Amino acid sequence: ISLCVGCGNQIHDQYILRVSPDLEWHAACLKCAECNQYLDESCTCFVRDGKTYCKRDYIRLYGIKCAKCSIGFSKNDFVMRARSKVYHIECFRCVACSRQLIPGDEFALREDGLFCRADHDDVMVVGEPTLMDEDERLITRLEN
Ligand SMILES: [Zn+2]
Ligand SMILES: [Zn+2]
Ligand SMILES: [Zn+2]
Ligand SMILES: [Zn+2]
């Protein structure tokens, strides 16, 4: 037998959807925990804290995302760092003078945001921009 993890009842459909490892689902019960959408549409889905998510919602909630615009990154995107906070090369602006920061600029991360060594007045030296799966899991459609 196989008990659908979403609802607990037996799966009598022609195919059983398995989130790796060992999570068997009714196709209708495999929903994004936030947007409610069937995750059958995709090869993969994300699984944290016992909830199952689609990428958009995953990244938007748990993924690495940008400290300014609050939007996730593309696998080949190049990001500027601040101690703990990654940033879109386009969004690495001083929030006060609203202008770009470059490798070799004195700068500082304040609660309000990034500030250049002029609008600040701890201080740092802006660094070189850089390019770039733990909770991600494979969806397989097993025949019943
Ligand atoms: Zn079910
Ligand atoms: Zn979603
Ligand atoms: Zn950004
Ligand atoms: Zn500034």
UniProtKB/Swiss-Prot annotation:
Top-level taxonomy: Eukaryota, Metazoa, Chordata, Craniata, Vertebrata
Boundaries of the shown chain within the full protein: 14 to 134 of 349
Protein name (database record): Insulin gene enhancer protein ISL-1
Entry function: DNA-binding transcriptional activator. Recognizes and binds to the consensus octamer binding site 5'-ATAATTAA-3' in promoter of target genes. Plays a fundamental role in the gene regulatory network essential for retinal ganglion cell (RGC) differentiation. Cooperates with the transcription factor POU4F2 to achieve maximal levels of expression of RGC target genes and RGC fate specification in the developing retina. Involved in the specification of motor neurons in cooperation with LHX3 and LDB1. Binds to insulin gene enhancer sequences. Essential for heart development.
Post-translational modification note: Ubiquitinated probably by WWP1 E3 ubiquitin ligase; ubiquitination is followed by protein degradation.
Annotated coiled-coil segments of the chain: none
Induction of expression: Down-regulated by beta-catenin/CTNNB1 in mesenchymal stem cells (at protein level). The down-regulation probably proceeds through ubiquitination by WWP1 E3 ubiquitin ligase and protein degradation.
Location of the LIM zinc-binding domain: 4-57, 66-120
Subunit structure: At neuronal promoters, displaces LDB1 from LHX3 LIM domain to form a ternary complex in which ISL1 contacts both LHX3 and LDB1; allosteric structural changes in the DNA binding domain of LHX3, induced by the ISL1:LHX3 interaction, may explain differences in sequence specificity of the different complexes. Interacts with LHX3. Interacts (via C-terminus) with POU4F2 (via C-terminus) isoform 1. Interacts with POU3F2. Interacts with POU4F3. Interacts (via N-terminal domain) with MLIP; the interaction represses ISL1 transactivator activity. Interacts with GCN5/KAT2A.
Deleted gene: phenotype: Embryonic mutants exhibit growth retardation at approximately 9.5 dpc and die at approximately 10.5 dpc. Between 9.0 dpc and 9.5 dpc hearts are severely abnormal, appear misshapen and unlooped. Hearts are completely missing the outflow tract, right ventricle, and much of the atria. Conditional mutants for retina expression show a decrease in several gene expression levels involved in the differentiation of retinal ganglion cells (RGC).
